[PDB]
Amino acid sequence: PASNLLSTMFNVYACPQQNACQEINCMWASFSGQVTATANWSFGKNIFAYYNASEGHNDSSWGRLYGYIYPSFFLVENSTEKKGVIYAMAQLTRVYGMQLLASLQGPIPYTQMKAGETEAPYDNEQTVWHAMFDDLDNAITILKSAATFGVNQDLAVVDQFYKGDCSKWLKFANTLKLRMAIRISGVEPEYAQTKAQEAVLGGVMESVGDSSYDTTNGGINENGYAIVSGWPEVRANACLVSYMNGYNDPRRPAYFTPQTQTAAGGYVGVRSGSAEIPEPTVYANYSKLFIATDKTLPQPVMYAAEAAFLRAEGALKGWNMGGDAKTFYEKGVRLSFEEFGVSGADDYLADATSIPGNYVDNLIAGHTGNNYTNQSSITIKWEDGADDAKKLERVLTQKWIACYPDPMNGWADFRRTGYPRIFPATESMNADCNTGRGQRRLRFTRSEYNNNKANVEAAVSMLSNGKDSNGTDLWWAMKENGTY
Catalog residues that contact Cl ion under the rule CB under 5 A.
39-40, 70-71, 83, 142, 152-153, 188, 190-191, 294-295, 469-470
- 306's enclosing H/E stretch is helix 304-316
Question: Distance (Å, rounded) from C-alpha 31 to C-alpha 70?
Answer: 27
Tell me whether residue 206 or residue 276 sits nearer to Cl ion (CB atom): 276
Q: Kindly state the DSSP code that residue 212 receives in the 8-state scheme.
A: E
Shortest separation between residue 365's beta carbon and Cl ion, angstroms? 20
DSSP, residue by residue, 52-120: ---HHHHTHHHHHHHHHHTTHHHHHHHHHTT-SHHHHHHHHHHHHHHHHHHHHHS-B--TT--TT-S-P
Tell me whether residue 43 or residue 371 sits nearer to Cl ion (CB atom): 43
Tell me whether residue 46 or residue 245 sits nearer to Cl ion (CB atom): 46
Tell me whether residue 83 or residue 381 sits nearer to Cl ion (CB atom): 83
Shortest separation between residue 336's beta carbon and Cl ion, angstroms? 24
Shortest separation between residue 444's beta carbon and Cl ion, angstroms? 11
Shortest separation between residue 460's beta carbon and Cl ion, angstroms? 12
Shortest separation between residue 279's beta carbon and Cl ion, angstroms? 6
Shortest separation between residue 428's beta carbon and Cl ion, angstroms? 11
Q: Kindly state the DSSP code that residue 452 receives in the 8-state scheme.
A: S
Question: Distance (Å, rounded) from C-alpha 455 to C-alpha 448?
Answer: 8
Tell me whether residue 421 or residue 441 sits nearer to Cl ion (CB atom): 441
Question: Distance (Å, rounded) from C-alpha 227 to C-alpha 375?
Answer: 33
Question: Distance (Å, rounded) from C-alpha 308 to C-alpha 445?
Answer: 36
Smallest Cα–Cα separation from 193: which of 298, 355, 289, 311? 311
Tell me whether residue 70 or residue 323 sits nearer to Cl ion (CB atom): 70
Shortest separation between residue 230's beta carbon and Cl ion, angstroms? 9
* Amino acid (one-letter) located at 91: Q
Question: Distance (Å, rounded) from C-alpha 197 to C-alpha 424?
Answer: 34
Question: Environment class of residue 115 by beta-carbon count within 10 Å: exposed (0-12), middle (13-18) or buried (19+)?
Answer: exposed
Partnered with residue 212 across adjacent β-strands are 302
Tell me whether residue 41 or residue 371 sits nearer to Cl ion (CB atom): 41
Number of neighbours of residue 41 by Cβ within 10 angstroms = 14
Shortest separation between residue 146's beta carbon and Cl ion, angstroms? 8
Smallest Cα–Cα separation from 128: which of 481, 482, 474? 474
User: Residue 145 in contact with residue 78, Cβ under 8 Å?
Assistant: no
Question: Environment class of residue 43 by beta-carbon count within 10 Å: exposed (0-12), middle (13-18) or buried (19+)?
Answer: middle
At 477 the three-state DSSP class reads: coil
Shortest separation between residue 417's beta carbon and Cl ion, angstroms? 17
Tell me whether residue 153 or residue 248 sits nearer to Cl ion (CB atom): 153
* Amino acid (one-letter) located at 281: T
Tell me whether residue 188 or residue 473 sits nearer to Cl ion (CB atom): 188
Smallest Cα–Cα separation from 421: which of 378, 371, 369, 469? 378
Shortest separation between residue 472's beta carbon and Cl ion, angstroms? 8
Shortest separation between residue 40's beta carbon and Cl ion, angstroms? 5
End-to-end CA distance of the chain: 45
Question: Distance (Å, rounded) from C-alpha 156 to C-alpha 147?
Answer: 13
